Structure 1
Amino acid sequence: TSDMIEMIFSKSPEQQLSATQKFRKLLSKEPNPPIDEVISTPGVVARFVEFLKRKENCTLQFESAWVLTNIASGNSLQTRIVIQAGAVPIFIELLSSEFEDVQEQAVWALGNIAGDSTMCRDYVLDCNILPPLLQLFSKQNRLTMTRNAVWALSNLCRGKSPPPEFAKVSPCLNVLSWLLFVSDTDVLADACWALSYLSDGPNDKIQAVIDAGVCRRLVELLMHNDYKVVSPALRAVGNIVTGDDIQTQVILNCSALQSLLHLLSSPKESIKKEACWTISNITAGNRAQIQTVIDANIFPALISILQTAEFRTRKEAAWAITNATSGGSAEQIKYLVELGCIKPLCDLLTVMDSKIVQVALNGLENILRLGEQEAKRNGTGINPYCALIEEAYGLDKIEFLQSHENQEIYQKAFDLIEHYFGTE
């Protein structure tokens, strides 16, 4: 409308508000709103950014903030104009506004801008969003504020390529720790998502996360009723146990394994997979830690999963079994063999995925090596797991691989095609 444009650029606060309110309602109507039609109008987005500065009018500041938030949702191209209009620095000022409504919609706006990409996330961090954002948590705010603030926080910590500079996001760790004591499912879920991102990386980042005290509460949230909390809690836990052996003991001490054994029976397939994945990171542990998994009765369930679950779950359980065989003692491997791990591992050798075959081959290799230890404990010179692998895999297939002439043929065929046709 031309009265929308007139009233917007006019100099009366009544008409300014009235026009802006009609602008919001068009971007609030639910079917993917007309963002570009608004953004293309000359000086209109910059006019909304000018309204954010008007500290003596709560309603107008909120309506403006609501509008720019919704423009900020959607395309990167659309979210570009909001940044270039210079709204980020001003939204961060509004985090210290005297009106709650304004403070809270500023956070949401910035959450959207932080969520657009790696480069927008860092700019927001480089405009010092964090100090005022963490100050929101410093008072008894309403529940919707707390949710919006943690959600924004999680968007600041998010992204792997490249991740945020750790010194800019790690100060939020103290807040995240006490937020795991809140009951609200939305806040718990996003607090966990934030932590899963912060512990995704080298072991110095995991040390900062453990140092904040979060592992016990994380481990406790693996038993929540809502998969919205369990998924991210499980993702954080799984990442922390990609730590050295000290770091992963920190989680075992919180009794994670009985909770992990429970999540292996989950009806939700992605939780099953994530629980295998987590457990495989622990079985990459020391023999002590492999024994704790044995004593929790985890392996019968992993072996069941290894032979009946869908591929992507099967692959994680394979990693779990194989890491156990890389690190474990002869007696621990003997037990895994007695629960029947060789057959499922052999069955993976025929699957058309080179990554799972690598893992399966590595586990069979480790089993066989320890079978040489048992072939000198008993003095026969017979590896006991030779006959078992033969039973599982087939004499045909063993005979094919026993041929050095077959080995020479494949080596040459691979070498030849890769050289003249290129590798792929």
Structure 2
Amino acid sequence: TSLEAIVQNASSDNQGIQLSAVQAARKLLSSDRNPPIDDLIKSGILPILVHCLERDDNPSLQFEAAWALTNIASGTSEQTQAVVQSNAVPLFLRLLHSPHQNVCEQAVWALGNIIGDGPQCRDYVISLGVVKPLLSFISPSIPITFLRNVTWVMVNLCRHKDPPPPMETIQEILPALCVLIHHTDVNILVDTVWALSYLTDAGNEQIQMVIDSGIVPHLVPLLSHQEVKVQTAALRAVGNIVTGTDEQTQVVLNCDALSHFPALLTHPKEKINKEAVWFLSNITAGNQQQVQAVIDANLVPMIIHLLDKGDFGTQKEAAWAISNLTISGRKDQVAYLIQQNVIPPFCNLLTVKDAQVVQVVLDGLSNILKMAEDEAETIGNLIEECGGLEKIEQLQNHENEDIYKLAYEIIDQFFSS
């Protein structure tokens, strides 16, 4: 029972023999995590498998052939490409109108792998009109395992932002997301929220689409979902939104977003820590009302704490937050920052190797100093006492001339007798 024999029997004009052979090809393609795909592609089985999709008289054969093709397409780009170059894609689309659920589902799956290969493949499967048939499967009578596959392909359809998915696709997918965000199934919920991630990632125009749909009041509460996989994705999704305009950012804050952040800032997982302060850094880049909202939510001391004792990633995000507040805020808003003891943990970051962080801290100190007027000396003294001035003083080296210049001007304007 060889591979060369399998491709032969697969050519048979008899269907029993053919089905059996195609089943054999499927079995070779689902025996481990590293199937003999390249060998299968070289055997010439691909055109045979593709033609089997035509056989409306035999759903078993359509399903088995689709399954074999699906696994070939789960591989590398070159292996997925071999499937699409055999002209399989239009037949999968055809099979989405199949009256048989098994065939529909395997067509959906195979198309998901092809869509996931890249934006060009995404755009091609879209332009043939995959989205509307796909989303039509969504019903309450659909088997959860089927629905999980649909929502996964939905993600792939939303992924890649250069070029981003077309208007028509997004406008189709959003109302299906409004439905699925209410599902209790965790896998589905996770995908629904990750699809929103990517949508909100394509930029401010797409963010307005997500906002305009009415989905955000249902998305913000998933920052506190009991399932960490849901939270992680909701953090990314809502986080993307608040990189939008101030008005867009406000839509989120008005859903009481900041109430959810104590439990993320103190979360065991540092990755959640990091993304939480990232988020908050984008808020302190907002207007003064929005800086005020972070302060009022009692979030600044947890920020300064993570700024002090957090892993480098969270510290990097924390410094931006501080720096962004330092230029967004009012005089008193910055005063609060200082009386919350920001000056020492902020200054200690001047030693790190990441040059961007160092310019971000230096930019912070500079805004603080130019802003507190009578208190220049008073704050100069704070900077000096924690050893910040010492750190600033030796950033006056030439390995980074941007850092250098900024170190020089702070020292010239604020620490020269």
The aligned residue for residue 15 of structure 1 is 17
| 1:363-402 superposed matches below 5 A | 363-372=364-373, 375=374, 383-397=377-391
Deviation at 1:408, TM superposition (A): 9.9
When residues 157 and 408 of structure 1 are mapped into structure 2, their CA distance, relative to the original with a 3 A threshold, is: closer
Instruction: Report sequence identity in percent.
Output: 49
Query: 2: CA distance between counterparts of 1:395 and 1:81?
Result: 62
Deviation at 1:138, TM superposition (A): 4.6
The aligned residue for residue 290 of structure 2 is 289
When residues 89 and 327 of structure 1 are mapped into structure 2, their CA distance, relative to the original with a 3 A threshold, is: same
Query: 2: CA distance between counterparts of 1:178 and 1:409?
Result: 54
User: In the TM superposition, what whole-angstrom CA distance separates every residue of 1:4-43 from its partner, at most 9, and x where no partner exists?
Assistant: 223210111211111111111111112411101111113x
User: In the TM superposition, what whole-angstrom CA distance separates every residue of 1:216-251 from its partner, at most 9, and x where no partner exists?
Assistant: 221111111222111111100000111111111111
Query: 1: CA distance between counterparts of 2:218 and 2:102?
Result: 31
Q: Do 1:390 and 1:398's aligned partners in 2 also have CA atoms closer than 8 Å?
A: no
Query: 1: CA distance between counterparts of 2:67 and 2:344?
Result: 60
Q: Do 1:68 and 1:109's aligned partners in 2 also have CA atoms closer than 8 Å?
A: yes
The aligned residue for residue 6 of structure 2 is 4
The aligned residue for residue 36 of structure 2 is 34
Query: 1: CA distance between counterparts of 2:40 and 2:399?
Result: 67
Aligned-partner residue type, residue 191 of structure 1: T
Aligned-partner residue type, residue 390 of structure 1: E
When residues 395 and 200 of structure 1 are mapped into structure 2, their CA distance, relative to the original with a 3 A threshold, is: closer
The aligned residue for residue 411 of structure 2 is none
2:214 is paired with a residue of what secondary structure?
coil
Q: Bigger CA drift: 389-398 or 75-84?
A: 389-398
Q: Do 1:107 and 1:149's aligned partners in 2 also have CA atoms closer than 8 Å?
A: yes
When residues 409 and 126 of structure 1 are mapped into structure 2, their CA distance, relative to the original with a 3 A threshold, is: closer
Query: 2: CA distance between counterparts of 1:408 and 1:193?
Result: 44
When residues 398 and 227 of structure 1 are mapped into structure 2, their CA distance, relative to the original with a 3 A threshold, is: closer
Q: Do 2:66 and 2:106's aligned partners in 1 also have CA atoms closer than 8 Å?
A: yes
When residues 301 and 287 of structure 1 are mapped into structure 2, their CA distance, relative to the original with a 3 A threshold, is: same
Query: 1: CA distance between counterparts of 2:203 and 2:233?
Result: 19
2:298 is paired with a residue of what secondary structure?
coil
Deviation at 1:259, TM superposition (A): 0.8
| 1:211-360 superposed matches below 5 A | 211-360=212-361
When residues 112 and 382 of structure 1 are mapped into structure 2, their CA distance, relative to the original with a 3 A threshold, is: closer
Q: Do 1:261 and 1:296's aligned partners in 2 also have CA atoms closer than 8 Å?
A: no
When residues 399 and 164 of structure 1 are mapped into structure 2, their CA distance, relative to the original with a 3 A threshold, is: closer
The aligned residue for residue 418 of structure 1 is none
TM-score when normalising by structure 1: 0.90
Q: Bigger CA drift: 122-131 or 391-400?
A: 391-400
2:29 is paired with a residue of what secondary structure?
helix
1:187 is paired with a residue of what secondary structure?
helix
TM-score when normalising by structure 2: 0.91
2:201 is paired with a residue of what secondary structure?
coil
Aligned-partner residue type, residue 166 of structure 2: E
Q: Do 1:114 and 1:121's aligned partners in 2 also have CA atoms closer than 8 Å?
A: yes
User: In the TM superposition, what whole-angstrom CA distance separates every residue of 1:332-374 from its partner, at most 9, and x where no partner exists?
Assistant: 11111111111111111111111111211121122112212xx
Query: 2: CA distance between counterparts of 1:366 and 1:198?
Result: 35
Query: 2: CA distance between counterparts of 1:383 and 1:39?
Result: 74
CA RMSD of aligned residues (A): 2.2
Deviation at 1:139, TM superposition (A): 5.7
| 1:49-198 superposed matches below 5 A | 49-138=50-139, 140-198=141-199
Query: 1: CA distance between counterparts of 2:164 and 2:107?
Result: 24
1:28 is paired with a residue of what secondary structure?
coil
When residues 305 and 407 of structure 1 are mapped into structure 2, their CA distance, relative to the original with a 3 A threshold, is: closer
Query: 2: CA distance between counterparts of 1:382 and 1:6?
Result: 86
Unaligned runs of 5+ in 1: 376-380, 416-424
Query: 2: CA distance between counterparts of 1:197 and 1:267?
Result: 26
When residues 410 and 45 of structure 1 are mapped into structure 2, their CA distance, relative to the original with a 3 A threshold, is: closer
Q: Kindly tell me the number of residue pairs found equivalent between the two proteins.
A: 402
Deviation at 1:201, TM superposition (A): 3.0
1:222 is paired with a residue of what secondary structure?
helix
